Design an enzyme around this catalytic site. Structure first.
Site, short mmCIF file in Angstrom:
data_model
loop_
_atom_site.label_atom_id
_atom_site.label_comp_id
_atom_site.label_asym_id
_atom_site.label_seq_id
_atom_site.Cartn_x
_atom_site.Cartn_y
_atom_site.Cartn_z
N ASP A 1 -2.03 -5.14 -7.87
CA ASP A 1 -2.12 -3.91 -7.02
C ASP A 1 -0.54 -3.77 -6.96
OD1 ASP A 1 -2.00 -1.75 -5.01
OD2 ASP A 1 -4.15 -2.28 -5.01
N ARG B 1 -4.66 -10.45 -0.78
CA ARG B 1 -5.68 -9.11 -1.27
C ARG B 1 -5.24 -8.29 -2.33
NH1 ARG B 1 -2.93 -7.28 3.21
NH2 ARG B 1 -1.22 -5.74 2.97
N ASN B 2 -3.91 -8.39 -2.74
CA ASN B 2 -3.30 -7.62 -3.85
C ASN B 2 -3.27 -8.56 -5.22
OD1 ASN B 2 -3.10 -5.33 -2.46
ND2 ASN B 2 -1.10 -6.02 -1.52
N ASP C 1 4.43 -5.21 -0.46
CA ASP C 1 3.06 -5.80 -0.07
C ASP C 1 2.51 -6.88 -0.74
OD1 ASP C 1 0.50 -5.34 1.41
OD2 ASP C 1 -0.09 -3.78 -0.09
#
Length: 255
Positions: free
Chosen positions: A150, A136-137, A132
């Site tokens: 994350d 956004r992480n 992932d």
């Protein structure tokens, strides 16, 4: 790693998280009487299933020690369950890039890609597959320092073999990193805006790729396109990406 609740003072909410809101706070420890920290919270941590998943992130983070991966400070494992971690004071990368779109020079954007590539080369050396990799992480610790922060499917980031076969490998991570580099050079714009998730796979199979961002150096877009080889075995590894981003970064600094 268990921290007593009395030693944590919960402060301002600094953002959203997968399991619940993330707050900043103060950890009053024997080693440091007032340490600024981030506090990840978990709504529905009374569910044994949710709590297990939530705290697995802490177990994962604890295995890693790298300057561009956020560090675990501790956990509070009684309701409400919290994960205490290193505070990245400038927040989510996507937000950061959107607000600072005309303050950030190209060299900073390439620096961020380079720094993330060093974190991912490290995870690659431990044979850890992230699954992932996306803007956004990523968290922003300082104007010159980002960190991997994350640990529905993100179809628009996913390698074709991930979409088609639910196959997640170090190769599929490199594809995702390619998309993350595009997001950074696009100042936090999402890939494939205006396209339904269901059509994305059709476009990749048709041979379409995300276009070269404005002011992206051709060397860097070339590197992104190598990340998006349909055949996983033709994609670079993070060691090569890291070395190539370093060269590109110095080229841009010499400009």
């Amino acid at each position: 790693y268990e921290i007593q609740r009395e030693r944590i003072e919960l402060g301002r909410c600094i953002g959203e998280g997968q399991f619940g809101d993330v707050h900043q706070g103060i950890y009053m420890s024997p080693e440091n009487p007032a340490m600024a920290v981030a506090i990840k919270t978990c709504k529905n941590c009374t569910s044994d299933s949710v709590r297990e998943k939530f705290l697995q992130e802490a177990l994962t983070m604890r295995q890693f020690d790298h300057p561009h991966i956020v560090k675990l400070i501790g956990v509070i494992t009684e309701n409400p369950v919290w994960i205490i971690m290193e505070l990245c004071t400038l927040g989510e990368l996507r937000s950061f890039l959107q607000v600072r779109k005309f303050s950030l020079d190209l060299a900073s954007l390439i620096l961020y890609a380079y720094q993330l590539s060093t974190a991912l080369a490290y995870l690659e050396s431990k044979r850890f597959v992230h699954r992932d990799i996306a803007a956004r992480n990523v968290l922003v610790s300082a104007t010159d320092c980002v960190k991997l922060g994350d640990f529905k499917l993100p179809i628009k980031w996913m390698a074709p073999e991930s979409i088609n076969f639910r196959r997640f490998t170090s190769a599929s991570d490199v594809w995702m990193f390619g998309v993350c580099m595009w997001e950074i050079l696009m100042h936090g714009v999402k890939p494939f805006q205006g396209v339904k998730n269901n059509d994305v796979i059709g476009r990749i199979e048709n041979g379409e790729r995300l276009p070269m961002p404005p002011n992206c150096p051709p060397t860097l877009y070339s590197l992104m396109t190598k990340c998006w080889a349909y055949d996983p075995s033709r994609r670079p590894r993070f060691t090569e990406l890291k070395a190539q981003l370093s060269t590109i970064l110095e080229e841009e600094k010499l400009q």
